[model samples]
Target: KLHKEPATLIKAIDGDTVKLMYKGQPMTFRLLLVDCPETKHPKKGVEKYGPEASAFTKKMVENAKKIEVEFDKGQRTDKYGRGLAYIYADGKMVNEALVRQGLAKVAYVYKPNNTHEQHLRKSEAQAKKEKLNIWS
Candidate 1:
């Protein structure tokens, strides 16, 4: 029941962010609902399991034949003006995958943009039960 738009990934940054070509222009897109471990940060540089999460996203997105993005009914960008979306790689939603695998955790929750919150949270619960990376 969500809207989808065509896009092409220019580069994968981490498990939760990417630079992609959308509507003929390149833009930074932060994956919605899920937040992956921090790979690069000033204070929290190279967090635990960060590299594994980063590798997962980079591999899945880079190897995808087609990439797409889905925006919520609310705000499309964060305070930094980076576009927010639910990323789909060849029809597979990577956001949920990250949470399900425990490489990412459900963190950034905002109003009206959580159309897929139920699904993502369910995935996170499963990961927690299994004690995956972040959960462990």
Candidate 2:
């Protein structure tokens, strides 16, 4: 059975990039199954619809009483030492919710342990078909 540890939300940078306290320490976690619209640019300031995605993600986390993080077994951390994990908030897998709601698109792949890749892809497909948020 796949499970996770309770994490406290330190920040919801955007859709995919999030900060959490795992096991009582802070770590940046990149949402494993999806990429959210970029919200800020060092030069551009913020992309179109980037703030929308960011705000939505922020609200999603804010609504959660507690957030849980489950690291991807296929590939734990990325090149930057940022953790790669699925986020759970409000009794739901926030990764799937982000894709299902059209806030993000399925992305990033490793191997052998993309446990939820197919499910994530399906959610993307449905979101695209329904023309949800980014899919619109």
Candidate 3:
């Protein structure tokens, strides 16, 4: 089963992470099935394309009139207690956008929770085929 909850963006932490208001409190959500360039890592500092990815996420999220977090049937939270879900901004899946734009890659795939993996991978392959950003 899938569960979706309405949310409001507090901020975009990095490419693949965001803080949002869900259920009356600000919550951190780590996007599932995707990994973007390191923007806020202490050791990594900033990697190539990191800023671009984060910017894209922030832009999409902040401009949205409606935001939602959709959870898969499996794990709902990470060890850090951050929520894990696919973000939808104004009806668009932000996770798919990152991969389709070559800002992120399909990764961290596991059981049940991997519902969108194939779709994300297809978008990633197209981006790679075009040699976009990170793929280039």
Candidate 4:
């Protein structure tokens, strides 16, 4: 993932999606290998940890400061049509960071693209061990 050039994060669309300025063009990027709780939905309304998940993302990602996005070498987009990537902010892996903090769960493994799946799982394990946020 780090082998490719990175994008600058402009804003976070949600826990999993972010608005980025790539090559001077703004785009939406869905984080790969992890899924945070939803905020609110029409059908589901809101999950137990939805608001906290979204808030965590907002704080983690800019409004992230100097966040970087790396496109996964596997698949381009999910079935929902959003671009997939590995997001980095504050010199930490954002996806894993959320799971490690117990604010998210590992999900969505796109073939060849999920190079960090094991790494994410480790974070979740650490979070569970510590009983952070959602894990509690």
Candidate 5:
């Protein structure tokens, strides 16, 4: 049976990368369908509010007592065979939240279970208007 697990978010590697601890194992997750500005790329430089995005993500997911992962039809593995899933924390979709906050961009990798696509788009639009992370 699929069960939710509690984990501690140890660190944020970048806008889209995070590390968590589960069952004494360190797990790395890449936010499924969103790409944020390059924070570590020296050439591209950091995007506006990039650090804020990471901080927000950490605030939301770090030390989460419970988390649920729902898998969608797609490539399944991220070349490294790490399971690709939409991470939920306390019933909130983390991916959507990040996009809604203007921290990330919608990535159309798997179009099947993209039920949240429209909402994400709307959120991005709102973020753009507000000149959130993407805007300087």
Candidate 6:
């Protein structure tokens, strides 16, 4: 469901989470379809390119400019009660961007109605081929 397109800027809460204002309501979103190196998970420890991934995510979503979000069938309020959504900015899917840039790994949290799954997979494959983030 395309909610009122509101300009939102990402505020990083952690490597995996971010907060922003959407439709005059504060919203937090976890990057779906991708898993970045842990920055908040104590056990996992910070993995390579973790900070870069976070920074990249922030940069990609910078500014509270109009943006769009597409939802998968399984998308619902997470444990934290934050709505789970696949964010899109300027026609580019944020989740796929992270995987495409090699900032994160493919994560299939949703199976059915996961329209973005195939794109995420392809993005990851391209990232692997180009060795974008991992290469350096």
lDDT of each: 0.89, 0.83, 0.93, 0.78, 0.71, 0.71
Give the per-residue lDDT digits (tens) of candidate 2, residues 74-95: 7778899889888888778888
By lDDT, the best candidate is 3
Which parts of model 4 have CA positions greater than 4 angstroms off?
Answer: 63-65
Write model 6 residue lDDT over 41-129, tens digit each, in one string: 76876778888887876776774255666556774567887766777767677778788888888875566646577778888899999
Poorest lDDT segment (10 consecutive residues) of candidate 4: 1-10
Error of 6 at 35 (Å): 0.8
In candidate 3, where is summed lDDT lowest over 10 consecutive residues?
Answer: 36-45
Task: For residues 48-114, write the lDDT of model 3, one tens digit per residue.
Answer: 9999999999999999999999998898999999998999998899999999999999987889889
TM-score of each: 0.95, 0.89, 0.96, 0.87, 0.73, 0.81
Summing lDDT over every window of 10 consecutive residues in candidate 1, give the lowest-scoring window: 35-44
Which is the winner by lDDT between candidate 4 and candidate 5?
4
lDDT of 2 at 45: 66
**Global Cα lDDT for candidate 2:** 0.83
TM-score of 3: 0.96
Encode model 1's per-residue lDDT on 1-136: one tens digit a residue. 6788999989989878899999999899999988777889658798888889889999999999989899988999999878989999899998988999999999878888988999999999999999998888
Provide the clash count, candidate 4: 1
TM-score of candidate 5 versus the correct structure, residues matched by position: 0.73
Clash counts for the predictions, in order? 0, 0, 0, 1, 0, 1
- Winner by lDDT between candidate 5 and candidate 2: 2
What does the lDDT read for residue 26 in candidate 2? 89
**Least lDDT summed over 10 consecutive residues: which range in candidate 6?**
1-10
lDDT of 4 by residue, 1-136 (tens): 1554567767776777788888788888888888777765657767877787777777887654567767777777668767788888766778887898888899967578878889899989999999988888
Ranking 1 against 5 by TM-score, winner: 1
Q: Please give the ranking of all candidate structures by TM-score, highest first, separated by commas.
A: 3, 1, 2, 4, 6, 5
Better of 5 and 6 by TM-score: 6
